[PDB]
């Protein structure tokens, strides 16, 4: 309970303030926060709007063209850390074209762990010269703070208020000039003794614990941190996650079951809405690193036996192979996520070329359809194909469909090849050279046909054989 | 770049500008033998300038490189036709304004 409320995902809030209330219970945003393009908002809309629970953002904060907003002091009074795990064009904090913003007022912002600050084209923006960014970021060299009201001769930045100029805000040097540091007319910038480093300190100047980041409620206690330097677990800041926990999103400790829930079967959405989380070196991560593949029953990344299996996700869940060139697009694939349609009418050395590009496919999650593939005599080029799942089917609930293949004489050699078809039915029509015995064998193995073929029948025997070093005579 | 003048400044004829798309550091003149045919360097022959008297004769030879990829580092150097060669400078073509990365992101 160092972050008592919820952990929320990244958000992108536009046009209206309606969706903004989705942040009302977040202590931590695990992702970024973008607030933009609110052209009809006015100061009154922000007078009674506050998210005091927000302590930390793991990625970045971006504010662009939000009208009526004059300060962030009431919106994010307690935002202490922006980790910058992911950045917006190298920036962890972006304030851009905030017409009406008079001050930042992020009076609790102590540390920006990674990335820089970009504060640009804010025509009313003051209280920038009063911020000592060297206390917040290790390198201010890449900060880009320009084209604000502060650039001209119009900011009357005033920190003193209580007594005015007698023992109030801390003062630090720019080049040679001492400048009192504050965020607003009523809020000083917090500055700790150098021995405290980035850990923070209490109001009395006593150092927070070395596992704390930015601030704490009590000194030298890792259960009293506002935020953690390393990892968070059960209201405590820890250097590393202890067993049986895993390091997640570079800031918290999670259990196996959590990682498992994330992983499980985000049905479709492979393209930005799934990943399928794995375990590697005590981390719960989006995918296995290079050289590793995922042992399925325990989510554990294990090193690859030779080259790693390669999952090819097809666009729209299908692909038509009608040439050597299209087949090549699948070279190296061991798993097809989707369905294949074979439509090959002509070419040269096709069995070898097709085997080179498609011979490694072991599994197809959808269906396999062979249609009008005039050039094919066999499907044996699919050398390693052992499974068709039928998770998707051709209309009529078919997982294997063969239609109008005028020279097809073999599917696979059923004396050697094993093929399993989990779901769906078979369809065979207009395969004139394909004996029904081959189809019937396939039904067994897997769990208008042959009309132009006579299927083996009689046996011719050799009545005579004669060898020469260069010749053979037979009868 | 600097104009080159040999001892007897007379008959100055040619410069040669070399540029290749480069990553970092690891670039040299005598790289992957240019020999005769398939080359490792993009080369330009630059005509010798016209002096225009003695006081202010630095009508600095130059060149406009076109046909470059954006946000790309280029290894570049000049040589005087067989005197002086310039050092290898890396020059990175322009990329997107932060503002313009934002737009394309923020608006579908």
């Amino acid at each position: 309970h160092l972050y008592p409320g919820e952990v929320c995902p990244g958000m992108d809030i536009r046009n209206n303030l309606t969706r903004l209330h989705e942040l009302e219970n977040c202590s931590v945003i695990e992702g970024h926060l973008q607030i933009l393009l609110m052209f009809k908002t006015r100061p009154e809309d922000f007078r009674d709007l506050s998210f005091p629970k927000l302590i930390m953002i793991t990625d970045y904060l971006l504010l662009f063209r939000v009208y009526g907003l004059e300060s962030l002091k009431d919106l994010f009074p307690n935002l202490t850390v922006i980790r910058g795990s992911r950045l917006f064009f190298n920036y962890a904090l972006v304030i851009f074209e905030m017409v009406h913003l008079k001050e930042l007022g992020l009076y609790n912002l102590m540390n920006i762990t990674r990335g820089s600050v970009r504060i640009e084209k804010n025509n009313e923006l003051c209280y920038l010269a009063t911020i000592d960014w060297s206390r917040i970021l290790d390198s201010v060299e890449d900060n880009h703070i320009v084209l604000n009201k502060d650039d001209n001769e119009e900011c009357g930045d005033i920190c003193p208020g209580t007594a005015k100029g007698k023992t109030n805000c801390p003062a630090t040097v720019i080049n040679g000039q001492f400048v009192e540091r504050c965020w607003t007319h009523s809020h000083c910038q917090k500055v700790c003794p150098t021995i405290c480093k980035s850990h923070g300190c209490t109001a009395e100047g006593l150092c927070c614990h070395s596992e704390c980041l930015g601030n704490c409620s009590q000194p030298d206690d890792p259960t009293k941190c506002v935020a953690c330097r390393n990892f968070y677990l059960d209201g405590r800041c820890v250097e590393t996650c202890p067993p049986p926990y895993y390091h997640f999103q570079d800031w918290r400790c999670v259990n196996f079951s959590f990682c498992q829930d994330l992983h499980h079967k985000c049905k479709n959405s492979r393209r930005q809405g799934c990943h399928q989380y794995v375990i590697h070196n005590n981390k719960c991560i989006p995918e296995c690193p290079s050289g590793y593949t995922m042992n399925s029953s325990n989510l554990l990344c294990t090193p690859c036996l030779g080259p790693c299996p390669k999952v090819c996700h097809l666009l729209e869940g299908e692909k038509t192979i009608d040439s050597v060139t299209s087949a090549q697009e699948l070279r190296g694939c061991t798993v097809i996520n989707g369905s294949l349609i074979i439509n090959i009418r002509g070419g040269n050395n096709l069995a070898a070329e097709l085997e080179a590009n498609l011979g490694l496919i072991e599994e197809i999650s959808g269906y396999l359809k062979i249609r009008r593939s005039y050039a094919l005599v066999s499907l044996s080029f699919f050398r390693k194909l052992r499974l068709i799942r039928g998770e998707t089917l051709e209309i009529g609930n078919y997982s294997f469909y063969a239609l109008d293949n005028q020279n097809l004489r073999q599917l696979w050699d059923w004396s050697k090849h094993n093929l399993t078809i989990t779901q769906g039915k078979l369809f065979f029509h207009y395969n004139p050279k394909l004996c029904l015995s081959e189809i019937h064998k396939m039904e067994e193995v897997s769990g208008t046909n042959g009309d132009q073929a006579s299927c083996e029948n009689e046996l011719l025997k050799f009545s005579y054989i004669r060898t020469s070093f260069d010749k053979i005579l037979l009868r | 770049w600097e104009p080159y003048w040999p001892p007897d400044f007379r008959d100055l004829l040619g410069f040669m500008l070399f540029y290749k798309e480069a990553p970092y550091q690891n670039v040299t003149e005598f790289d992957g033998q240019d020999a005769c045919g398939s080359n490792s360097w993009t080369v330009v022959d630059i005509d010798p300038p016209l002096r225009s008297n003695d006081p202010k004769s630095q009508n600095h030879p130059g060149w406009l490189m076109r046909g470059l990829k954006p946000w790309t580092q280029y290894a570049i150097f000049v040589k005087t036709l067989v005197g002086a060669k310039s050092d290898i400078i890396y020059v990175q073509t322009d990329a997107t304004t932060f503002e313009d990365y934002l737009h394309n992101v923020v608006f579908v």
Partner: peptide, 21 residues
């Protein structure tokens, strides 16, 4: 891109509309 559609280019008053969120 929108930058490429209307800045390093010129975009039709409708092309401009389309994806207004």
């Amino acid at each position: 891109g929108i930058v490429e559609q209307c800045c390093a280019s010129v975009c039709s008053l409708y092309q401009l509309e389309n994806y207004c969120n």
